[PDB]
Design an enzyme around this catalytic site. Structure first.
Site, PDB file in Angstrom:
ATOM      1  CB  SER A  47      13.483  -3.466  -8.258  1.00 43.65           C
ATOM      2  OG  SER A  47      13.887  -2.798  -7.066  1.00 43.65           O
ATOM      3  NE  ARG A 227      11.986   4.706 -12.376  1.00 42.80           N
ATOM      4  CZ  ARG A 227      11.706   3.980 -11.300  1.00 42.80           C
ATOM      5  NH1 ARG A 227      12.514   2.992 -10.938  1.00 42.80           N
ATOM      6  NH2 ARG A 227      10.606   4.223 -10.595  1.00 42.80           N
TER       7      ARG A 227
END
Ligand SMILES: *C(=O)[C@H]([C@@H](C)O)[C@H]1CC(SCCNC=N)=C(C(=O)O)N1
Length: 242
Positions: A47, A227
């Site tokens: 993405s 992340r």
């Protein structure tokens, strides 16, 4: 100049994972990473590809502006936020793959391939299905290559209109407070090994910008929050954010 700081490995090791953080100080034109090798290893963008895809869709008129509504196709998918109408802003916020798959089909292979070459984006390879090649096709990009691309976007130097770049940077807005602004995009690649999470973007300060690109091994979706958490820990350590 590039500097390797293996002490940042602790931020991954402390969480039983492995990955790379790459930082770029725009004022000083200096880069930093915990792992020079992995910083230059190429992965599926997943993405994170919604940044270039959005730019192309806007510049070609596939997307008119950030308010245009992309109606849910009525097919129930397992991500609830996907089962709803979206505009560019929310589709990016919730990484709504099927909206971007439709962008890609309307862009078409030829214009997509040309535009990625004009962007110098990764290995510029769209082999695979035009509506999924960033999830399971031939395109690959490294963290250092993400930073190069993002630097061009920040400076409006990509070969699309200033308007298209401003809109995508608006859509990348993730966090803002009195201390910093983060414009960024997450990614999660699962269809080809190794499964990884991405976070790429930059941190705007009063007097500088710090570009960042990270990826990390992601065997399960349980670690996805790492992340941002790992990236911010590096930023905190380097006194970029409080
Ligand atoms: C982007 O990289 C992924 C991909 C599915 O397009 C989306 C989805 C998620 S979280 C859901 C993962 N499972 C999907 N079946 C993200 C994310 O980065 O959090 N992006």
């Amino acid at each position: 100049e590039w500097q390797e700081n293996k002490s940042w490995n602790a931020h991954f090791t402390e969480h039983k994972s492995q990955g790379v953080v790459v930082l770029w100080n725009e004022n000083k034109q200096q880069g930093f990473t915990n792992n020079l090798k992995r910083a230059n290893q190429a992965f599926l963008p997943a993405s994170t590809f919604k940044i270039p895809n959005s730019l192309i869709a806007l510049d070609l008129g596939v997307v008119k502006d950030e308010h245009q509504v992309f109606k849910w196709d009525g097919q129930t998918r397992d991500i609830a936020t996907w089962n709803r109408d979206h505009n560019l802003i929310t589709a990016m916020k919730y990484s709504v793959v099927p909206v971007y798959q439709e962008f890609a089909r309307q862009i078409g292979e030829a214009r997509m391939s040309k535009m990625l070459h004009a962007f110098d984006y990764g290995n510029e390879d769209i082999s695979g299905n035009v509506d999924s090649f960033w999830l399971d096709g031939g395109i690959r990009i490294s963290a250092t290559e993400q930073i190069s691309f993002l630097r061009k976007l920040y400076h409006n130097k990509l070969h699309v209109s200033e308007r298209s770049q401003r809109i995508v940077k608006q859509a990348m807005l993730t966090e803002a407070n009195g201390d910093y602004i983060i414009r960024a995009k997450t990614g999660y690649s699962t269809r080809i090994e190794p499964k990884i999470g991405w976070w790429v973007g930059w941190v705007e300060l009063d007097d500088n910008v710090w570009f960042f690109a990270m990826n990390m091994d992601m065997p399960t979706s349980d670690g996805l929050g790492l992340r941002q958490a790992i990236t911010k820990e590096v930023l905190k350590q380097e006194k970029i954010i409080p």
